[PDB]
Every structure is written in C-alpha cells, then in structure tokens.
Amino acid sequence: GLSDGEWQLVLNVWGKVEADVAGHGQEVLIRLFKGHPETLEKFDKFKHLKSEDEMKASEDLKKVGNTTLTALGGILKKKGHHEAELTPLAQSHATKHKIPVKYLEFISEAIIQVLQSKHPGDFGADAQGAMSKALELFRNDMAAKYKELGF
Numbered sequence: 001g002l003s004d005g006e007w008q009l010v011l012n013v014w015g016k017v018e019a020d021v022a023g024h025g026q027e028v029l030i031r032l033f034k035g036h037p038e039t040l041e042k043f044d045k046f047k048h049l050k051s052e053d054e055m056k057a058s059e060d061l062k063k064v065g066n067t068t069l070t071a072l073g074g075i076l077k078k079k080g081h082h083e084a085e086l087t088p089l090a091q092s093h094a095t096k097h098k099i100p101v102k103y104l105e106f107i108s109e110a111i112i113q114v115l116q117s118k119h120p121g122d123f124g125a126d127a128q129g130a131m132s133k134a135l136e137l138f139r140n141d142m143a144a145k146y147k148e149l150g151f
C-alpha cells in the first residue's frame with residue numbers, strides 16, 4: 001500500500017539509478033558484502049574476492065550488480081502489480097540460489113545506504129520513507145511466494 005504520491009517519489013529516485021545502473025549495482029553489492037559477509041558465500045563466482053579492491057576490479061560483480069538492479073527497476077515500475085515479474089525471481093532464488101528471505105532484507109538496506117551516500121540532496125525524509133516501503137512490499141511478496149513454493 002504505497003499512495004500514488006509515494007510511488008511517484010520512488011520512481012523519481014529510481015530515475016537517478018537509471019542514469020547509471022551498473023555503478024549503483026556495484027556499490028550496492030560491495031555495501032552488502034562489506035556489511036554481511038556471509039552473503040558473499042552464495043556467489044560462487046565471488047568466493048575468492050578478498051578485498052574491496054578486488055570487488056571494485058571485478059567485472060562479473062559489476063554485471064551481477066547491473067542485472068540485479070535492472071530486475072528491481074522492472075518490478076518497481078509495476079507499482080505493486082508485479083506478480084509475474086516476481087514469480088520467476090522467487091522460483092530461482094528459493095530453489096536454485098537458495099537465498100533466505102533475510103538476505104532480501106540485507107540487500108534492501110544496502111540499496112537505501114547507496115541512495116543515501118550518492119544522492120543526499122534527492123533522498124530526503126519523504127523519498128527515504130517511500131523507498132523503504134516499496135522495498136518492504138517487495139520482500140513481503142517474495143516471502144509469500146516462498147511459502148507458497150513450500151519454503
């Protein structure tokens with residue numbers, strides 16, 4: 001339940017992400033791995049990255065980051081009516097990448113932390129609150145799909 005007004009602030013912030021998705025994507029993943037290092041273990045391609053300097057140099061990290069944020073933007077733009085963009089995501093993350101719902105909370109916070117560090121003048125009190133409700137709706141739908149898949 002975001003109001004139209006909140007969907008709008010979400011989409012205005014998202015616009016800044018879209019002017020550089022791969023740079024924001026890389027920062028988001030280095031923020032999650034620095035803050036919850038155990039999340040790094042689900043990424044077989046990144047098992048072996050040892051420093052922030054190796055994460056910054058990694059070509060595959062830039063790509064997964066990019067892919068992650070392109071898929072999130074596609075959902076957000078649906079404004080809550082994302083059942084179909086969401087199912088395949090839940091299927092893959094539940095059954096193949098095996099991501100627990102808590103990890104969805106860690107990535108939500110890295111996303112907020114990156115928007116906050118990069119766009120402080122555009123990520124005021126209002127945009128913070130709208131963004132945060134949108135990520136929460138996203139986690140709650142994911143969790144519901146998980147339960148339904150029997151996980």
Ligand code: HEM
Nearest residue numbers: 039042043045064067068071072089092097099103104107
């Ligand atoms: C914003 C929430 C997320 C979105 C939108 C997202 C999106 C995606 C997409 C679109 C793919 C590629 C296709 C697929 O396998 O479904 C992918 C792959 C993957 N995701 Fe996520 N993801 C999210 C959260 C996470 C989290 C929190 C983790 C682990 C902590 C994770 C782990 C993985 C792994 C291990 C892969 C395979 C990557 C590879 O080596 O190519 N995802 N993700």
